Write a protein that binds this ligand. Structure first.
Ligand SMILES: *[C@@H]1O[C@H](CO)[C@@H](O[C@@H]2O[C@H](CO)[C@@H](O[C@@H]3O[C@H](CO)[C@@H](O)[C@H](O)[C@@H]3O)[C@H](O)[C@H]2NC(C)=O)[C@H](O)[C@H]1NC(C)=O
Ligand SMILES: *[C@@H]1O[C@H](CO)[C@@H](O[C@@H]2O[C@H](CO)[C@@H](O[C@@H]3O[C@H](CO)[C@@H](O)[C@H](O)[C@@H]3O)[C@H](O)[C@H]2NC(C)=O)[C@H](O)[C@H]1NC(C)=O
Ligand SMILES: *[C@@H]1O[C@H](CO)[C@@H](O[C@@H]2O[C@H](CO)[C@@H](O)[C@H](O)[C@H]2NC(C)=O)[C@H](O)[C@H]1NC(C)=O
Ligand SMILES: *[C@@H]1O[C@H](CO)[C@@H](O[C@@H]2O[C@H](CO)[C@@H](O)[C@H](O)[C@H]2NC(C)=O)[C@H](O)[C@H]1NC(C)=O
Ligand SMILES: *[C@@H]1O[C@H](CO)[C@@H](O[C@@H]2O[C@H](CO)[C@@H](O)[C@H](O)[C@H]2NC(C)=O)[C@H](O)[C@H]1NC(C)=O
Ligand SMILES: *[C@@H]1O[C@H](CO)[C@@H](O)[C@H](O)[C@H]1NC(C)=O
Ligand SMILES: *[C@@H]1O[C@H](CO)[C@@H](O)[C@H](O)[C@H]1NC(C)=O
Ligand SMILES: *[C@@H]1O[C@H](CO)[C@@H](O)[C@H](O)[C@H]1NC(C)=O
Ligand SMILES: [Zn+2]
Lengths: 184, 596
């Protein structure tokens, strides 16, 4: 089953322009990831991970995230925050497994890997499994909005990955395998 | 479309920009401090220019929101910090003159040297030089010669510049809608807002006066003992009942009295505690010292050190290959980067400095969750105090005896305790009057109560009334004595030290009492106590998010400065001083002057 292209890729995407990779037509036997990648985090909120080999899946989607350290705990059902409210929202009956791992050796530069952006501002809320790519200038007042400068802001802000940051600022790659058993 | 939301969004943008900018500035400063190179200086200058320009630009955008419409008590402090005109109140020529005079004063103080008379080829700088003469010489005439000289060439050449410095500083202070520049410094302790926890700017002066009015008898007894002891070294140069001349105190200005330990030791037969030999016999390096400090800190429930801390921080001087400035420092670069910079050799003093700096690092690590503008101490005194409480706790004989660095049969007697108390006293208690006097003089000058032609007439009387020191030679209006100090030539406050000294003993007493200690305070160890660790942590992790009164109440239990622990820590020393000087003269009089 195709996971080498996903879980051993070249490059991933920013949080606001997340992929929805489609995986289909195979038998879920992910023991290879246990040896290839020593997963520090592994949370399955549905059925037991050991019993996951009992049933196969058809319409599972996966996502490509590069987020901070003290941010992965926000990727959980019923949580709140900037990322949960503005980039990626999970359902209450979320049936899948979240997997993350450190990626310092391939996602950092001395000057800075300024290639990952994240949404910070919005005059609205999000809905589960929504993707937005809007780059329109954001209004903060009553006055008409014309470019950046005064209160109008560009609703995209970048990260600052450097090799000598602490654990809470180094990137963890999160691939949310939300395989719903009833729809698969 | 309300205003508080717009202010909040501006704060959100500022927090994200400032983090990266400040990280770059700190990293450049660290790299420059480790090495020495001209292009590194250029890079540091460029980074500082970028940081300053970013701060100045971001200040302008914050002026749109008036402060009076805010009901949050949390964003208010951030906006108040950001909304302050840094140096934009003045005109361009005013700023040019101010920067010119400040740099001129700094350079003049930096490059001061003195030449011995009739020897044009023999000149000495201030440091090294006059410091060695003051600190390790028993001669008499040379000390007087240097004391007269340095002041004579420095004060007369720096007074006129200081006049314009004072004038411009007062002009700026009045421009920023304050009373005077002394009010500008007093404003750091100001907390206004929440009911029950108000602290006006004018209350600090009265608090300082009332608190100092209590330790004066102990200082009197200690000063009488010192004067009695000095009769053996200067038989024919000390007045029997007068004040101690300032030229025989072991320092250029008289800040500390530490250099008198070997001359006023109570029982000199038994030497003090020094654990060097056991340190050498086990082949100790910096790694063992730092891991022992880590073990001590984790013993009370505090977290450990970060994994990167053991890797990115240098512990010993590399040698001749590189060239750094050896001065202990704990660096808070942000974003989970904490490092310690110190040139280490196996000695007890460095073993204590390690604890001091690691406590500093733990305090930095405590408040990492607060916003950027709130990541500092409650005021300008908590930081070194939290540093020093650990040092006081870790150097007691009981702690050294327990950890296996001393003989398991080591009999502690009641004979070394007097020596230890006197050694601590000569460096802690003997400095408070000096700080109090200097701050009083500076505030009186800024307010203006002392006319320009009557400065010395009050300056030398304050010395006699507070520190008990009398000038050895007559002086005229040409001299400018106070400007010779490091913190006077440079723009720096001085009231931090009094607050630190008062706070540290209060913290120590609270932790010892909550730690189930038996006996006098001087034999206390804060080890093995989660009770004293949780209490401290409830203050460590607040940061600047709460008024300092509430932060103090979570540890001490009282919301005001207290002086009882400072007198409690010296109960047996006070008893011995009372016993010893029953047959001597008490107090000092302004009657004897060496020149008359
Ligand atoms: C002053 O303004 C700040 C900023 O708006 C207020 O901070 C907010 O305080 C509330 C709690 O009173 C926080 O709520 C909680 O947030 C967590 C997620 O972080 C959520 O899981 C909880 O269910 C709850 O909603 C809120 O996050 C926090 N906001 C920020 C941006 O820090 C503060 O409360 C205001 N102070 C007063 C006295 O009203
Ligand atoms: C913070 O410091 C403490 C104290 O140094 C660290 O404690 C460490 O805990 C582990 C787990 O108990 C110790 O390892 C071994 O545990 C087994 C039992 O599972 C025991 O049989 C072994 O004899 C051994 O104790 C470890 O030695 C101990 N100390 C050290 C030096 O690591 C803790 O891990 C540190 N953690 C953090 C967050 O920094
Ligand atoms: C993930 O993909 C990389 C890139 O193809 C693999 O890297 C190669 O690993 C082999 C191991 O023997 C080396 O001989 C090659 O030189 C590596 N790359 C190159 C340049 O071809 C990596 O092994 C893959 N691993 C996983 C987890 O599937
Ligand atoms: C320094 O801060 C004061 C705040 O009082 C600024 O004062 C303003 O002065 C201008 C010109 O007199 C008035 O239009 C504004 O309404 C004042 N603002 C307030 C809030 O009183 C002053 O401009 C600042 N100086 C600078 C930034 O150079
Ligand atoms: C204070 O801390 C020391 C830290 O070592 C404690 O020492 C240990 O105490 C237990 C008590 O049963 C002994 O078995 C260990 O051998 C001790 N370790 C040593 C001496 O290194 C000490 O007990 C603590 N204080 C009190 C009163 O409990
Ligand atoms: C994500 O989608 C983009 C679409 O252009 C594609 O280029 C990229 O390779 C995809 N990668 C992943 C991680 O699925
Ligand atoms: C400091 O200088 C030495 C030699 O000049 C060099 O090897 C080292 O890399 C420098 N330090 C840094 C952080 O670049
Ligand atoms: C120790 O205690 C004894 C008790 O009689 C006392 O005489 C002595 O002076 C004390 N101090 C010293 C320094 O021995
Ligand atoms: Zn310190």
């Amino acid at each position: 089953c195709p996971f080498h292209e996903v879980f051993n890729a070249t490059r991933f995407a920013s949080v606001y322009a997340w992929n929805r990779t489609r995986i289909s037509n195979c038998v879920a036997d992910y023991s290879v990831l246990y040896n290839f990648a020593p997963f520090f985090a592994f949370k399955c909120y549905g059925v037991s991970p050991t019993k996951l080999n009992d049933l196969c899946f058809t319409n599972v989607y996966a996502d490509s995230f590069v987020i901070k350290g003290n941010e992965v705990s926000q990727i959980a059902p019923g949580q709140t925050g900037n990322i949960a409210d503005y980039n990626y929202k999970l359902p209450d009956d979320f049936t899948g497994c979240v997997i993350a791992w450190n990626s310092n050796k391939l996602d950092s530069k001395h000057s800075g890997n300024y290639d990952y952006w994240y949404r910070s501002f919005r005059k609205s809320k999000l809905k589960p499994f929504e993707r937005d790519i809007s780059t329109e200038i954001y209004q903060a007042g009553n006055k008409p909005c014309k470019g950046k400068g005064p209160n109008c802001y560009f609703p995209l802000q970048s990260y600052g990955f450097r090799p000598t940051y602490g654990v809470g600022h180094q990137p963890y790659r999160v691939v949310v395998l939300s395989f719903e058993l009833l729809h698969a | 479309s309300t205003i508080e939301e717009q202010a909040k969004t501006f704060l959100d943008k500022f927090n994200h920009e400032a983090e990266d900018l400040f990280y770059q500035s700190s990293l450049a400063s660290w790299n420059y401090n480790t090495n020495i190179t001209e292009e590194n200086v250029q890079n540091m200058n460029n980074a500082g220019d970028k940081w300053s320009a970013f701060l100045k630009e971001q200040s302008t955008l914050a002026q749109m929101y008036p402060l009076q419409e805010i009901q949050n008590l949390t964003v208010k402090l951030q906006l108040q910090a950001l909304q302050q005109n840094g140096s934009s109140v003045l005109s361009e020529d005013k700023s040019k003159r101010l920067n010119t005079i400040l740099n001129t004063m700094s350079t003049i103080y930096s490059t001061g040297k003195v030449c011995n008379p009739d020897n044009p080829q023999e000149c000495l700088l201030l440091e090294p030089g006059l410091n060695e003469i003051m600190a390790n010489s028993l001669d008499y005439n040379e000390r007087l010669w240097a004391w007269e000289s340095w002041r004579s060439e420095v004060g007369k050449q720096l007074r006129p510049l200081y006049e314009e410095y004072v004038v411009l500083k007062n002009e700026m202070a009045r421009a920023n809608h304050y009373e005077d520049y002394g009010d500008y410094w007093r404003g750091d302790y100001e907390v206004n807002g929440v009911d029950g926890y108000d602290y006006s700017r004018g209350q600090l002066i009265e608090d300082v006066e009332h608190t100092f009015e209590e330790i004066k008898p102990l200082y009197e007894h200690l000063h009488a003992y010192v004067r009695a002891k000095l009769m053996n070294a200067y038989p024919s140069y000390i007045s029997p009942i007068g004040c101690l001349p300032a030229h025989l105190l072991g320092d250029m200005w008289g800040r500390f009295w530490t250099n008198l330990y070997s001359l006023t030791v109570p029982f000199g037969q038994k030497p003090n505690i020094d654990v060097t030999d056991a340190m050498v016999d086990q082949a100790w390096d910096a790694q063992r010292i730092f891991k022992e400090a880590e073990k001590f800190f984790v013993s009370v429930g505090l977290p450990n050190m970060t994994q990167g801390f053991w890797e990115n921080s240098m512990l010993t001087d590399p040698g001749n290959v590189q060239k750094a400035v050896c001065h202990p420092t704990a660096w808070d670069l942000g974003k989970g980067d904490f490092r310690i910079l110190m040139c280490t050799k196996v000695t007890m003093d460095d073993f204590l400095t390690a604890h001091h700096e690691m406590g500093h690092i733990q305090y930095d690590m405590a408040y990492a969750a607060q916003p950027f503008l709130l990541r500092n101490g409650a005021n300008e005194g908590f930081h070194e105090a939290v540093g020093e409480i650990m040092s006081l706790s870790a150097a007691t004989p009981k702690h050294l005896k327990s950890i296996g660095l001393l003989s398991p049969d080591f009999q502690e007697d009641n004979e070394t305790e007097i020596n230890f108390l006197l050694k601590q006293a000569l460096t802690i208690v003997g400095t408070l009057p000096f700080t109090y006097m200097l701050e009083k003089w500076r505030w009186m000058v800024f307010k203006g109560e002392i006319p320009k032609d009557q400065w010395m007439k009050k300056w030398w009387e304050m010395k006699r009334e507070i520190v008990g020191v009398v000038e050895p030679v007559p002086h005229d209006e040409t001299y400018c004595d106070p400007a010779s100090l490091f913190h006077v030539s440079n723009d720096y406050s001085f009231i931090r030290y009094y607050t630190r000294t008062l706070y540290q003993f209060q913290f120590q007493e609270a932790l010892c009492q909550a730690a189930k200690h038996e006996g006098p305070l001087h034999k206390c160890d804060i080890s093995n106590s989660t009770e004293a660790g949780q209490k401290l942590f409830n203050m460590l992790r607040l940061g600047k998010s709460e008024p300092w009164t509430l932060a103090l109440e979570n540890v001490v239990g009282a919301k005001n400065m207290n002086v009882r622990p400072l007198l409690n820590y010296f109960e047996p020393l006070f008893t011995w001083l009372k016993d010893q000087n029953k047959n001597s003269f008490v107090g000092w009089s302004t009657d004897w002057s060496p020149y008359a």
